[PDB]
Amino acid sequence: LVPVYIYSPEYVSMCDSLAKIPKRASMVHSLIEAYALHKQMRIVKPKVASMEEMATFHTDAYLQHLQKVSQGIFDYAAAIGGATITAAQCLIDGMCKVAINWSGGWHHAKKDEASGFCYLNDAVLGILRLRRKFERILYVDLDLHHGDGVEDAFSFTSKVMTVSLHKFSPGFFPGTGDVSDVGLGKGRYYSVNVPIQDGIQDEKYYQICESVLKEVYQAFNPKAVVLQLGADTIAGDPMCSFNMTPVGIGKCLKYILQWQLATLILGGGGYNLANTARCWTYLTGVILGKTLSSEIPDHEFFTAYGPDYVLEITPSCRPDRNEPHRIQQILNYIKGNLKHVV
Numbered sequence: 001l002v003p004v005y006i007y008s009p010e011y012v013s014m015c016d017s018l019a020k021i022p023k024r025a026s027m028v029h030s031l032i033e034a035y036a037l038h039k040q041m042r043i044v045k046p047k048v049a050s051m052e053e054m055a056t057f058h059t060d061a062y063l064q065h066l067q068k069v070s071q072g073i074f075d076y077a078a079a080i081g082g083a084t085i086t087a088a089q090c091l092i093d094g095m096c097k098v099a100i101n102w103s104g105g106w107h108h109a110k111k112d113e114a115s116g117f118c119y120l121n122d123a124v125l126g127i128l129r130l131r132r133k134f135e136r137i138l139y140v141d142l143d144l145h146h147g148d149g150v151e152d153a154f155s156f157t158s159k160v161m162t163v164s165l166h167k168f169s170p171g172f173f174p175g176t177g178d179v180s181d182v183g184l185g186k187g188r189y190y191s192v193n194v195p196i197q198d199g200i201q202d203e204k205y206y207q208i209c210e211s212v213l214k215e216v217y218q219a220f221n222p223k224a225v226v227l228q229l230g231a232d233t234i235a236g237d238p239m240c241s242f243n244m245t246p247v248g249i250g251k252c253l254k255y256i257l258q259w260q261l262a263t264l265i266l267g268g269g270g271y272n273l274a275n276t277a278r279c280w281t282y283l284t285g286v287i288l289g290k291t292l293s294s295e296i297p298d299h300e301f302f303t304a305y306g307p308d309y310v311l312e313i314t315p316s317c318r319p320d321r322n323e324p325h326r327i328q329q330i331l332n333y334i335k336g337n338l339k340h341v342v
């Protein structure tokens with residue numbers, strides 16, 4: 001029951017050519033490899049998503065339209081979606097308790113519309129596969145942006161709960177995800193949104209996070225978990241909003257791991273290439289429970305980590321815009337919503 005690591009050379013080489021994240025996949029992979037972490041996980045080759053497999057969420061019209069424009073993104077969408085289905089497949093066959101796909105987590109993609117640079121929602125696809133064996137699924141999103149695509153996917157049902165800790169502020173994409181957003185139908189109060197401001201740091205973040213995941217856990221009682229960990233909340237990132245480091249995110253990760261539920265792990269945003277590699281390696285270490293060394297081990301992209309070549313990331317000098325009073329308002333409101341969840 002060792003963690004499954006969704007990798008093949010062809011999967012990495014492909015993701016390598018994605019837009020604003022060039023070669024990121026191989027940076028992540030080879031840095032992980034450079035910490036000998038691969039040697040501790042079951043390597044599983046990602047299987048390409050079939051047409052029907054994607055159409056489990058996206059319309060045939062959009063899926064066909066995606067072929068046309070990518071005349072390409074469609075093969076991108078097909079690879080990544082398949083990778084996440086594959087990881088979710090491994091969890092259901094029970095060959096692992098943890099399955100990793102760092103190239104997944106494209107949370108903005110809608111049923112028949114692309115947005116937020118997401119042309120296929122692999123998170124949704126994986127949540128659907130898991131449903132084959134797991135009754136209730138908890139989707140937890142810690143990316144910098146609201147996970148509206150995954151939220152929409154399931155917003156009407158109570159069998160899948162989404163919880164999203166994101167930056168919520170005017171002008172900021174997607175402009176949704178206030179605490180007042182709780183879903184609809186039988187699935188009302190089964191969407192959870194945690195609006196957060198700029199400059200927030202590891203400690204305050206993990207307190208807010210743990211606080212909510214404890215309530216949601218008792219209230220929902222999941223059999224599976226899907227965790228998007230977009231690195232675009234880490235200090236130094238071009239998004240320039242939160243003030244987080246991997247230590248804080250790993251604390252949220254480790255907390256969740258305690259549950260020992262089947263857990264599909266996904267990546268996400270993160271336009272700071274070396275920082276994003278630093279983060280998911282650290283986290284991949286957290287999953288393995290093996291503390292890594294502060295010194296980046298020489299490997300193909302060693303120079304990308306200069307000048308100091310360490311794994312730890314430093315917070316920038318900026319204000320924490322989150323007032324303790326507003327945070328408790330947000331939480332108490334969330335706590336109100338959870339009185340309805342059973």
Ligand SMILES: N[C@H](Cc1ccc(Cl)cc1Cl)C(=O)N1Cc2ccccc2C1
Pocket residue numbers: 021104105106107108116117118143145173230232267268269270
């Ligand atoms: N998380 C979103 C979408 C995303 C982008 C790149 C990668 Cl590698 C993964 C994901 Cl899942 C995001 O980072 N956005 C940045 C941005 C800037 C302006 C408007 C929308 C978005 C979405």
Ligand SMILES: [K+]
Pocket residue numbers: 141142143144145146147164165166
């Ligand atoms: K989020």
Ligand SMILES: [K+]
Pocket residue numbers: 154155156157158160161162183187190191
């Ligand atoms: K829901």
Ligand SMILES: [Zn+2]
Pocket residue numbers: 143144145230232268269270
């Ligand atoms: Zn993002």
